[PDB]
Amino acid sequence: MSSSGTSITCEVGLQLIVPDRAPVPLVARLDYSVDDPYAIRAAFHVGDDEPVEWIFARELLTVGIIRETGEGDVRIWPSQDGKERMVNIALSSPFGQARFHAQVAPLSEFLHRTYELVPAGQESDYIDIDAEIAEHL
Amino acid sequence: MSSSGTSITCEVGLQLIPVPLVARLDYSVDDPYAIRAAFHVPVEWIFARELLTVGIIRETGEGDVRIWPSQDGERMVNIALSRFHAQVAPLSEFLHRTYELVPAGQESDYIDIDAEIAEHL
Amino acid sequence: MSSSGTSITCEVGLQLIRAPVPLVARLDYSVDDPYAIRAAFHVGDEPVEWIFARELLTVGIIRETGEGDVRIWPSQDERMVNIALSSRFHAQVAPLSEFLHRTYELVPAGQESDYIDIDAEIAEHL
């Protein structure tokens, strides 16, 4: 039963794949907080850029490494690069989907660490604590 | 507010960021993950109960909804569908009542009952 | 405990509610994505796939509910279910209900966690 404050962060190498253009490398900051136990925040930025932050369900990324899935405008699916296992994340927009491309190992490792803090199915405990703090604040 | 054992409803003072307005929140065990809010200037928003519980403590969001806390010296909650401003005390009390009917993590039982009803129509 | 590959599919008659236009939708559920249901259909316009929470459909057959853009609610005609994404489908409950029952037989409501744990475990060994 981890402390109410616990949180983890890492950085992951990514590529922005654009239809009629070459790939653009970029680093994404992933983080997970036990106070928001169903979520993963991801801050993407290109080169010397201030980030834009996406927030989505942790389970969507766990499932998306294994099979094509999605929620609303987010869409995640796996892929191969010969032997190398990849995961693809896309934001849907009428103005054309943009697409991220990353290797599985680092995302998997990060997710494994999040599950060590809060195992799948025990998120409730942390929701209860959040509710309890609010009920005294 | 008022509780029936099956459904709960309350009214909460809000501001559209300022213009004051009253919102009607309600929760029903037959939709155990959801909270419905109804505004006036009527329009109904429906979102995950957990999103509001988490949003009182820290910035979070789902799709177009974004919820985050703030200070007025008084603890506030901000909801912003792609900007509402309200006191935490009333929302917290309402959420506590919903958790008394259906504790976090036991929503499944009520989903099972909804499925059981449907299998016979 | 069903195996990691288990999946079910069915076809369901639908109407897009102008004049009503009949169309067939392909629903499928996979234990690897235990909270989700996929919906795929076409008119004429190449196919399009929607993905939503299983529980949203189970709840929507009983009462008005929604998540983000999706909105599901029941109605009378024969018992009907109405689904309405934004940027209106009309179907009988019997077939959806039977399909949802089959999905709960594979993965009961509340045991999705086990299948998430397997998905994590596979990734961890890739």
GROMACS .gro file of C-alpha atoms in nm:
model
  384
    1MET     CA    1   0.000   0.000   0.000
    2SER     CA    2   0.212   0.287  -0.142
    3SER     CA    3   0.209   0.640   0.002
    4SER     CA    4  -0.045   0.890  -0.131
    5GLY     CA    5   0.238   1.089  -0.291
    6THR     CA    6   0.419   0.820  -0.488
    7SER     CA    7   0.496   0.885  -0.854
    8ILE     CA    8   0.731   0.762  -1.132
    9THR     CA    9   0.861   0.920  -1.447
   10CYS     CA   10   1.074   0.818  -1.740
   11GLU     CA   11   1.183   0.935  -2.083
   12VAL     CA   12   1.131   0.735  -2.401
   13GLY     CA   13   1.267   0.771  -2.755
   14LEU     CA   14   0.993   0.814  -3.016
   15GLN     CA   15   0.940   0.894  -3.381
   16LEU     CA   16   0.666   1.108  -3.535
   17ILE     CA   17   0.567   0.927  -3.856
   18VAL     CA   18   0.416   1.158  -4.120
   19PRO     CA   19   0.277   1.003  -4.447
   20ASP     CA   20   0.479   1.181  -4.723
   21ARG     CA   21   0.775   1.281  -4.498
   22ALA     CA   22   1.075   1.117  -4.326
   23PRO     CA   23   1.050   1.025  -3.952
   24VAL     CA   24   1.125   1.291  -3.689
   25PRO     CA   25   1.287   1.174  -3.364
   26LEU     CA   26   1.148   1.311  -3.036
   27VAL     CA   27   1.163   1.231  -2.665
   28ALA     CA   28   0.846   1.173  -2.461
   29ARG     CA   29   0.816   1.202  -2.085
   30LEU     CA   30   0.585   0.940  -1.935
   31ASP     CA   31   0.463   0.964  -1.580
   32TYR     CA   32   0.236   0.784  -1.341
   33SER     CA   33   0.103   0.894  -1.003
   34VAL     CA   34  -0.077   0.667  -0.752
   35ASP     CA   35  -0.322   0.961  -0.698
   36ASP     CA   36  -0.443   0.911  -1.057
   37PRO     CA   37  -0.411   0.532  -1.063
   38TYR     CA   38  -0.589   0.460  -1.395
   39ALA     CA   39  -0.395   0.727  -1.592
   40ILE     CA   40  -0.060   0.773  -1.769
   41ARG     CA   41   0.045   1.126  -1.863
   42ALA     CA   42   0.270   1.162  -2.172
   43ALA     CA   43   0.448   1.488  -2.259
   44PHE     CA   44   0.571   1.487  -2.621
   45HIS     CA   45   0.806   1.749  -2.762
   46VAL     CA   46   1.019   1.791  -3.074
   47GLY     CA   47   1.384   1.896  -3.015
   48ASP     CA   48   1.415   2.220  -2.813
   49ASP     CA   49   1.034   2.236  -2.766
   50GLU     CA   50   0.816   2.294  -2.461
   51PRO     CA   51   0.582   1.994  -2.430
   52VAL     CA   52   0.214   1.928  -2.506
   53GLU     CA   53   0.064   1.679  -2.259
   54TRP     CA   54  -0.162   1.383  -2.338
   55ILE     CA   55  -0.333   1.185  -2.068
   56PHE     CA   56  -0.483   0.840  -2.122
   57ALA     CA   57  -0.586   0.520  -1.953
   58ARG     CA   58  -0.296   0.301  -1.846
   59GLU     CA   59  -0.489  -0.011  -1.957
   60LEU     CA   60  -0.515   0.124  -2.311
   61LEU     CA   61  -0.135   0.117  -2.345
   62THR     CA   62  -0.106  -0.230  -2.185
   63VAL     CA   63  -0.365  -0.367  -2.430
   64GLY     CA   64  -0.228  -0.170  -2.732
   65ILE     CA   65   0.113  -0.337  -2.703
   66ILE     CA   66  -0.072  -0.669  -2.759
   67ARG     CA   67  -0.351  -0.573  -3.001
   68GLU     CA   68  -0.518  -0.285  -3.185
   69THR     CA   69  -0.737  -0.091  -2.945
   70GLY     CA   70  -0.855   0.263  -2.879
   71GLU     CA   71  -1.063   0.508  -2.680
   72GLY     CA   72  -1.227   0.811  -2.840
   73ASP     CA   73  -0.955   0.982  -3.045
   74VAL     CA   74  -0.659   0.780  -2.916
   75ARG     CA   75  -0.573   0.468  -3.111
   76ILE     CA   76  -0.294   0.222  -3.014
   77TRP     CA   77  -0.172  -0.085  -3.204
   78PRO     CA   78   0.135  -0.307  -3.228
   79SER     CA   79   0.373  -0.350  -3.524
   80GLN     CA   80   0.695  -0.529  -3.628
   81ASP     CA   81   1.031  -0.392  -3.756
   82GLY     CA   82   1.168  -0.728  -3.865
   83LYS     CA   83   1.249  -0.873  -3.524
   84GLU     CA   84   1.195  -0.543  -3.329
   85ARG     CA   85   0.851  -0.508  -3.158
   86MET     CA   86   0.690  -0.165  -3.193
   87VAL     CA   87   0.387   0.015  -3.052
   88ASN     CA   88   0.199   0.284  -3.245
   89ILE     CA   89  -0.007   0.563  -3.088
   90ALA     CA   90  -0.224   0.796  -3.293
   91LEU     CA   91  -0.437   1.105  -3.218
   92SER     CA   92  -0.741   1.118  -3.448
   93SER     CA   93  -0.845   1.450  -3.591
   94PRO     CA   94  -1.041   1.554  -3.903
   95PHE     CA   95  -0.722   1.737  -3.999
   96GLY     CA   96  -0.529   1.409  -4.040
   97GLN     CA   97  -0.405   1.157  -3.786
   98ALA     CA   98  -0.050   1.206  -3.661
   99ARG     CA   99   0.121   0.892  -3.540
  100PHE     CA  100   0.389   0.805  -3.292
  101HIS     CA  101   0.615   0.506  -3.327
  102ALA     CA  102   0.811   0.358  -3.037
  103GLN     CA  103   0.984   0.040  -2.928
  104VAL     CA  104   0.798  -0.178  -2.679
  105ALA     CA  105   1.075  -0.261  -2.429
  106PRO     CA  106   1.092   0.083  -2.260
  107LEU     CA  107   0.714   0.132  -2.246
  108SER     CA  108   0.672  -0.220  -2.112
  109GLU     CA  109   0.934  -0.163  -1.844
  110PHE     CA  110   0.770   0.159  -1.740
  111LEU     CA  111   0.427  -0.003  -1.724
  112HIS     CA  112   0.577  -0.287  -1.519
  113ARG     CA  113   0.700  -0.032  -1.265
  114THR     CA  114   0.352   0.130  -1.251
  115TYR     CA  115   0.196  -0.211  -1.181
  116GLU     CA  116   0.447  -0.268  -0.897
  117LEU     CA  117   0.316   0.049  -0.731
  118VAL     CA  118  -0.052  -0.020  -0.812
  119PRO     CA  119  -0.142  -0.370  -0.945
  120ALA     CA  120  -0.418  -0.398  -1.201
  121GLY     CA  121  -0.742  -0.415  -1.009
  122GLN     CA  122  -0.630  -0.235  -0.693
  123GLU     CA  123  -0.675   0.119  -0.824
  124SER     CA  124  -0.984   0.150  -0.599
  125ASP     CA  125  -0.771   0.183  -0.287
  126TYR     CA  126  -0.612   0.496  -0.423
  127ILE     CA  127  -0.946   0.639  -0.534
  128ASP     CA  128  -1.070   0.588  -0.178
  129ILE     CA  129  -0.774   0.781  -0.038
  130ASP     CA  130  -0.831   1.066  -0.286
  131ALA     CA  131  -1.194   1.081  -0.174
  132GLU     CA  132  -1.089   1.073   0.190
  133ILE     CA  133  -0.850   1.366   0.159
  134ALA     CA  134  -1.120   1.571  -0.017
  135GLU     CA  135  -1.361   1.486   0.273
  136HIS     CA  136  -1.128   1.665   0.519
  137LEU     CA  137  -1.013   1.948   0.285
  138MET     CA  138  -2.998   1.673  -0.146
  139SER     CA  139  -3.199   1.349  -0.130
  140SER     CA  140  -3.116   0.974  -0.134
  141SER     CA  141  -3.351   0.687  -0.230
  142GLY     CA  142  -3.125   0.380  -0.181
  143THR     CA  143  -3.108   0.341  -0.563
  144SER     CA  144  -3.040   0.698  -0.692
  145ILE     CA  145  -2.907   1.024  -0.540
  146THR     CA  146  -2.947   1.383  -0.652
  147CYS     CA  147  -2.821   1.719  -0.531
  148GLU     CA  148  -2.789   2.081  -0.639
  149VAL     CA  149  -2.458   2.268  -0.629
  150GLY     CA  150  -2.366   2.633  -0.673
  151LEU     CA  151  -2.127   2.694  -0.963
  152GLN     CA  152  -1.973   2.979  -1.162
  153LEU     CA  153  -1.901   2.987  -1.537
  154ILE     CA  154  -1.562   3.162  -1.564
  155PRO     CA  155  -1.821   3.530  -1.350
  156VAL     CA  156  -2.181   3.410  -1.399
  157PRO     CA  157  -2.350   3.217  -1.115
  158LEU     CA  158  -2.550   2.904  -1.201
  159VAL     CA  159  -2.692   2.596  -1.026
  160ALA     CA  160  -2.598   2.245  -1.141
  161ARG     CA  161  -2.793   1.926  -1.065
  162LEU     CA  162  -2.567   1.628  -0.997
  163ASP     CA  163  -2.709   1.280  -0.985
  164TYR     CA  164  -2.586   0.925  -0.945
  165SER     CA  165  -2.773   0.600  -1.000
  166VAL     CA  166  -2.651   0.248  -0.904
  167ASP     CA  167  -2.763   0.120  -1.249
  168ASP     CA  168  -2.486   0.337  -1.399
  169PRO     CA  169  -2.233   0.290  -1.116
  170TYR     CA  170  -1.927   0.450  -1.282
  171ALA     CA  171  -2.111   0.768  -1.391
  172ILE     CA  172  -2.216   1.107  -1.259
  173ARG     CA  173  -2.467   1.321  -1.446
  174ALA     CA  174  -2.464   1.703  -1.417
  175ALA     CA  175  -2.740   1.927  -1.561
  176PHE     CA  176  -2.671   2.301  -1.626
  177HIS     CA  177  -2.896   2.603  -1.705
  178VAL     CA  178  -2.839   2.954  -1.853
  179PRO     CA  179  -3.076   2.288  -2.013
  180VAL     CA  180  -2.772   2.071  -2.097
  181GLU     CA  181  -2.658   1.739  -1.946
  182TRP     CA  182  -2.295   1.626  -1.909
  183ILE     CA  183  -2.210   1.271  -1.815
  184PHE     CA  184  -1.867   1.169  -1.684
  185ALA     CA  185  -1.673   0.910  -1.491
  186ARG     CA  186  -1.721   0.943  -1.118
  187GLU     CA  187  -1.351   0.859  -1.063
  188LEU     CA  188  -1.250   1.155  -1.279
  189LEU     CA  189  -1.411   1.395  -1.033
  190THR     CA  190  -1.270   1.215  -0.728
  191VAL     CA  191  -0.918   1.242  -0.876
  192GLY     CA  192  -0.971   1.599  -1.011
  193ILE     CA  193  -1.036   1.734  -0.661
  194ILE     CA  194  -0.687   1.615  -0.565
  195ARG     CA  195  -0.492   1.675  -0.888
  196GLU     CA  196  -0.508   1.780  -1.254
  197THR     CA  197  -0.655   1.506  -1.471
  198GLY     CA  198  -0.880   1.455  -1.772
  199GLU     CA  199  -1.052   1.225  -2.017
  200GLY     CA  200  -1.101   1.324  -2.380
  201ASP     CA  201  -1.255   1.674  -2.383
  202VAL     CA  202  -1.324   1.697  -2.007
  203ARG     CA  203  -1.045   1.842  -1.788
  204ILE     CA  204  -1.071   1.870  -1.409
  205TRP     CA  205  -0.819   2.032  -1.171
  206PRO     CA  206  -0.806   2.181  -0.820
  207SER     CA  207  -0.739   2.544  -0.721
  208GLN     CA  208  -0.720   2.772  -0.415
  209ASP     CA  209  -0.920   3.082  -0.311
  210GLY     CA  210  -0.705   3.134   0.002
  211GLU     CA  211  -1.124   2.801   0.028
  212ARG     CA  212  -1.058   2.485  -0.183
  213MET     CA  213  -1.199   2.488  -0.538
  214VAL     CA  214  -1.251   2.243  -0.826
  215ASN     CA  215  -1.236   2.341  -1.194
  216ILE     CA  216  -1.412   2.150  -1.473
  217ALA     CA  217  -1.350   2.245  -1.840
  218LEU     CA  218  -1.513   2.067  -2.139
  219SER     CA  219  -1.343   2.149  -2.476
  220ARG     CA  220  -1.479   2.650  -1.765
  221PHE     CA  221  -1.678   2.586  -1.444
  222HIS     CA  222  -1.562   2.684  -1.094
  223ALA     CA  223  -1.708   2.532  -0.775
  224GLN     CA  224  -1.635   2.473  -0.404
  225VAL     CA  225  -1.503   2.128  -0.307
  226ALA     CA  226  -1.710   2.070   0.010
  227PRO     CA  227  -2.047   2.008  -0.166
  228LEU     CA  228  -1.901   1.791  -0.449
  229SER     CA  229  -1.701   1.593  -0.196
  230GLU     CA  230  -2.007   1.530   0.024
  231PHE     CA  231  -2.207   1.420  -0.281
  232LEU     CA  232  -1.927   1.185  -0.393
  233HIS     CA  233  -1.906   1.042  -0.040
  234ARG     CA  234  -2.277   0.958  -0.058
  235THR     CA  235  -2.229   0.785  -0.395
  236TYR     CA  236  -1.944   0.580  -0.246
  237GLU     CA  237  -2.173   0.476   0.043
  238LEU     CA  238  -2.423   0.331  -0.208
  239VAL     CA  239  -2.151   0.181  -0.432
  240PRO     CA  240  -1.795   0.172  -0.291
  241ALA     CA  241  -1.506   0.216  -0.531
  242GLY     CA  242  -1.428  -0.125  -0.682
  243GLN     CA  243  -1.772  -0.281  -0.637
  244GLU     CA  244  -1.938  -0.132  -0.945
  245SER     CA  245  -1.917  -0.481  -1.110
  246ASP     CA  246  -2.201  -0.618  -0.907
  247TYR     CA  247  -2.433  -0.351  -1.044
  248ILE     CA  248  -2.310  -0.409  -1.400
  249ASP     CA  249  -2.393  -0.782  -1.352
  250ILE     CA  250  -2.747  -0.691  -1.244
  251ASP     CA  251  -2.794  -0.466  -1.549
  252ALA     CA  252  -2.681  -0.756  -1.769
  253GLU     CA  253  -2.913  -0.999  -1.584
  254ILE     CA  254  -3.215  -0.772  -1.638
  255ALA     CA  255  -3.143  -0.735  -2.010
  256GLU     CA  256  -3.101  -1.109  -2.072
  257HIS     CA  257  -3.482  -1.118  -1.999
  258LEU     CA  258  -3.687  -0.862  -2.203
  259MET     CA  259  -0.978  -1.859  -1.689
  260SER     CA  260  -1.002  -1.843  -2.072
  261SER     CA  261  -0.681  -1.844  -2.279
  262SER     CA  262  -0.517  -1.526  -2.409
  263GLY     CA  263  -0.636  -1.564  -2.770
  264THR     CA  264  -1.006  -1.606  -2.713
  265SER     CA  265  -1.232  -1.389  -2.915
  266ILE     CA  266  -1.599  -1.373  -3.027
  267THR     CA  267  -1.772  -1.198  -3.313
  268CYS     CA  268  -2.124  -1.152  -3.438
  269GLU     CA  269  -2.327  -0.955  -3.688
  270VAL     CA  270  -2.621  -0.738  -3.591
  271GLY     CA  271  -2.891  -0.567  -3.797
  272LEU     CA  272  -2.896  -0.190  -3.755
  273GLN     CA  273  -3.065   0.121  -3.889
  274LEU     CA  274  -2.905   0.468  -3.932
  275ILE     CA  275  -3.178   0.716  -3.828
  276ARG     CA  276  -3.387   1.155  -4.399
  277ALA     CA  277  -3.521   0.797  -4.404
  278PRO     CA  278  -3.407   0.490  -4.209
  279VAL     CA  279  -3.119   0.308  -4.384
  280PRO     CA  280  -3.058  -0.058  -4.299
  281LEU     CA  281  -2.700  -0.174  -4.239
  282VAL     CA  282  -2.518  -0.465  -4.077
  283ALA     CA  283  -2.263  -0.411  -3.796
  284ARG     CA  284  -1.990  -0.652  -3.692
  285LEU     CA  285  -1.934  -0.662  -3.319
  286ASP     CA  286  -1.635  -0.831  -3.164
  287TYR     CA  287  -1.478  -0.887  -2.826
  288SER     CA  288  -1.136  -1.021  -2.737
  289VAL     CA  289  -1.020  -1.126  -2.392
  290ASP     CA  290  -0.688  -0.938  -2.460
  291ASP     CA  291  -0.894  -0.615  -2.460
  292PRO     CA  292  -1.135  -0.717  -2.184
  293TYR     CA  293  -1.312  -0.384  -2.124
  294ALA     CA  294  -1.375  -0.310  -2.496
  295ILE     CA  295  -1.616  -0.393  -2.775
  296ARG     CA  296  -1.533  -0.314  -3.139
  297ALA     CA  297  -1.813  -0.216  -3.383
  298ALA     CA  298  -1.751  -0.212  -3.761
  299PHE     CA  299  -1.993  -0.126  -4.045
  300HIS     CA  300  -2.036   0.038  -4.388
  301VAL     CA  301  -2.284   0.225  -4.607
  302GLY     CA  302  -2.263   0.208  -4.989
  303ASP     CA  303  -1.807   0.489  -4.819
  304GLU     CA  304  -1.535   0.241  -4.703
  305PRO     CA  305  -1.577   0.065  -4.359
  306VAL     CA  306  -1.542   0.233  -4.018
  307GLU     CA  307  -1.457   0.088  -3.677
  308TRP     CA  308  -1.579   0.225  -3.339
  309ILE     CA  309  -1.437   0.101  -3.011
  310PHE     CA  310  -1.608   0.155  -2.678
  311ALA     CA  311  -1.636   0.031  -2.320
  312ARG     CA  312  -1.837  -0.284  -2.285
  313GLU     CA  313  -1.998  -0.153  -1.967
  314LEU     CA  314  -2.129   0.149  -2.157
  315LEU     CA  315  -2.345  -0.078  -2.376
  316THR     CA  316  -2.458  -0.295  -2.084
  317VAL     CA  317  -2.569   0.020  -1.899
  318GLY     CA  318  -2.713   0.189  -2.211
  319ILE     CA  319  -2.959  -0.096  -2.267
  320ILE     CA  320  -3.105  -0.015  -1.922
  321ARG     CA  321  -3.074   0.366  -1.909
  322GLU     CA  322  -2.937   0.677  -2.079
  323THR     CA  323  -2.559   0.699  -2.041
  324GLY     CA  324  -2.252   0.818  -2.228
  325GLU     CA  325  -1.878   0.869  -2.244
  326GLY     CA  326  -1.725   1.161  -2.431
  327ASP     CA  327  -1.879   1.155  -2.781
  328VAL     CA  328  -2.068   0.827  -2.754
  329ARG     CA  329  -2.423   0.838  -2.615
  330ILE     CA  330  -2.634   0.526  -2.557
  331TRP     CA  331  -2.997   0.508  -2.446
  332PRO     CA  332  -3.294   0.268  -2.456
  333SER     CA  333  -3.630   0.318  -2.633
  334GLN     CA  334  -3.957   0.140  -2.718
  335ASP     CA  335  -4.110   0.026  -3.048
  336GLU     CA  336  -4.011  -0.428  -2.908
  337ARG     CA  337  -3.714  -0.306  -2.695
  338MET     CA  338  -3.455  -0.090  -2.872
  339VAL     CA  339  -3.106   0.052  -2.805
  340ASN     CA  340  -2.985   0.379  -2.950
  341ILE     CA  341  -2.615   0.469  -3.005
  342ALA     CA  342  -2.512   0.822  -3.122
  343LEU     CA  343  -2.146   0.930  -3.190
  344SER     CA  344  -2.072   1.300  -3.268
  345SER     CA  345  -1.834   1.490  -3.509
  346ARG     CA  346  -2.772   0.784  -3.466
  347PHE     CA  347  -2.798   0.407  -3.476
  348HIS     CA  348  -3.111   0.211  -3.384
  349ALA     CA  349  -3.103  -0.161  -3.300
  350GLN     CA  350  -3.298  -0.436  -3.125
  351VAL     CA  351  -3.177  -0.529  -2.777
  352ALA     CA  352  -3.207  -0.911  -2.806
  353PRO     CA  353  -2.902  -0.966  -3.031
  354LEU     CA  354  -2.679  -0.713  -2.847
  355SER     CA  355  -2.782  -0.858  -2.518
  356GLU     CA  356  -2.702  -1.216  -2.626
  357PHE     CA  357  -2.360  -1.106  -2.754
  358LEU     CA  358  -2.282  -0.919  -2.432
  359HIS     CA  359  -2.390  -1.231  -2.236
  360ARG     CA  360  -2.137  -1.435  -2.436
  361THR     CA  361  -1.864  -1.181  -2.358
  362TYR     CA  362  -1.942  -1.200  -1.984
  363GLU     CA  363  -1.921  -1.580  -2.005
  364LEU     CA  364  -1.561  -1.543  -2.131
  365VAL     CA  365  -1.474  -1.258  -1.892
  366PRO     CA  366  -1.720  -1.184  -1.610
  367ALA     CA  367  -1.764  -0.821  -1.510
  368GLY     CA  368  -1.499  -0.754  -1.247
  369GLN     CA  369  -1.239  -1.009  -1.367
  370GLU     CA  370  -1.092  -0.806  -1.648
  371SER     CA  371  -0.781  -0.751  -1.433
  372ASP     CA  372  -0.654  -1.103  -1.490
  373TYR     CA  373  -0.644  -1.042  -1.864
  374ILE     CA  374  -0.472  -0.708  -1.821
  375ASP     CA  375  -0.207  -0.887  -1.605
  376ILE     CA  376  -0.149  -1.143  -1.884
  377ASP     CA  377  -0.113  -0.866  -2.144
  378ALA     CA  378   0.146  -0.695  -1.920
  379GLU     CA  379   0.324  -1.027  -1.866
  380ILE     CA  380   0.355  -1.095  -2.238
  381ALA     CA  381   0.500  -0.747  -2.304
  382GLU     CA  382   0.749  -0.800  -2.022
  383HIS     CA  383   0.894  -1.108  -2.201
  384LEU     CA  384   0.909  -0.961  -2.557
   0.00000   0.00000   0.00000
